[PDB]
Symmetry: C2
Subunit: 206 residues, 2 copies
């Protein structure tokens, strides 16, 4: 699922995906998204939102005796509408993209076996074995979170996109009237290589 919204002088976007091979992934994803939106609407950062989602899912899972057997992946970003700065965080294989200078560029790191094997100096691992998720909301101890180091200054018309691949061809976006919604999307998906046709998108344009 996805959401975008504005509150507390920020516009934010979130995507969550339940872990398919596990128990009650849909509920884990719902709890992650719910926690994240509450945090973001109240003025919190994407990293705050990830940590709150983890806390909510971890507690829920233990209380159900499912800890480690349920979870979700997510990506979240927020633009501060007062100063024009971007922050983001992600866990798992949902992705964050910067839209700047007319081009879409990858921000976030994947947590999966292939990425980990590369960082260990062992080379990539193609196929389902490499796609296995190594960090997710609901993991027993969450140590690996991909996140912005410092807020990134944006100019009007620039922004951020989060992606997870009936929601097919559904898009959620936060934008102002002055933002042309024909042109922005056109380019982003003119560059829309990064995701499939099957992808759920959420984006914020300053």
């Amino acid at each position: 699922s996805n959401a975008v919204g504005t509150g507390g002088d920020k516009a934010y976007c979130v995507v969550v995906d339940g872990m398919g091979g596990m128990i009650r992934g849909d509920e884990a994803a719902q709890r992650a998204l719910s926690a994240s939106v509450g945090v973001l609407d109240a003025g919190g950062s994407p990293l705050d939102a990830v940590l709150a989602a983890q806390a909510a899912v971890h507690r829920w899972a233990s209380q159900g005796g499912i800890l480690g057997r349920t979870g979700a992946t997510m990506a979240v970003a927020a633009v501060n509408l007062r100063d024009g700065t971007l922050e983001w965080a992600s866990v798992g294989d949902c992705r964050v993209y910067l839209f700047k200078g007319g081009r879409l560029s990858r921000l976030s790191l994947d947590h999966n076996v292939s990425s980990e094997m590369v960082l260990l100096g062992r080379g990539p691992v193609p196929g389902p074995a490499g796609e296995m998720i190594t960090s997710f909301i609901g993991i027993e101890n969450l140590t690996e979170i991909s996140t912005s180091e410092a807020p990134l200054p944006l100019e009007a018309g620039e922004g951020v996109l989060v992606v997870s691949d009936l929601h097919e061809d559904r898009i959620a976006m936060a934008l102002s009237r002055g933002s042309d919604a024909r042109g922005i999307l056109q380019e982003v998906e003119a560059q829309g290589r990064p995701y499939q046709d099957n992808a759920t998108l959420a984006l914020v344009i300053l």
Copy 2:
């Protein structure tokens, strides 16, 4: 605050505003927004989302010893993507419009002293006096919610717009939130949606869904 999202078979939109004439309006609005989105994201109806918002604000206000002295108004709608049907709900002065046939058409009723007198078979109360809100999220007992009844069938390109424009609003920077299909026309729809006859203030908070 506003939000749109996609969860279950539904795409939804919501606007929430704290009651600025009362205390801790922004904190009330946060509980309402967060509770309503949790319900919507799980595939719940706009009415269920309103009832959850009410329960959350009421619970929080009570513990604060502030019940009835803090609150928010909101409007929410959801379109079922499988069958194209629309539901909506609102409390207070936020408004719900159908976008169809190139026009916005008012669905919902305001809860205010003027509409209360008219509902009771009397005449309107024009001006600020009649604008006093009679139903809001956080009210001691919430009995009045404006809602869809039979879900409304929509065709692709049709949709719903929710609006919060009240004068009482806290000052914030925001943006329009929209849930569309790649098949829609993003910039065209907003313009398409709104001619010189926009039924809301220039500073309005807006959220919308297009099938």
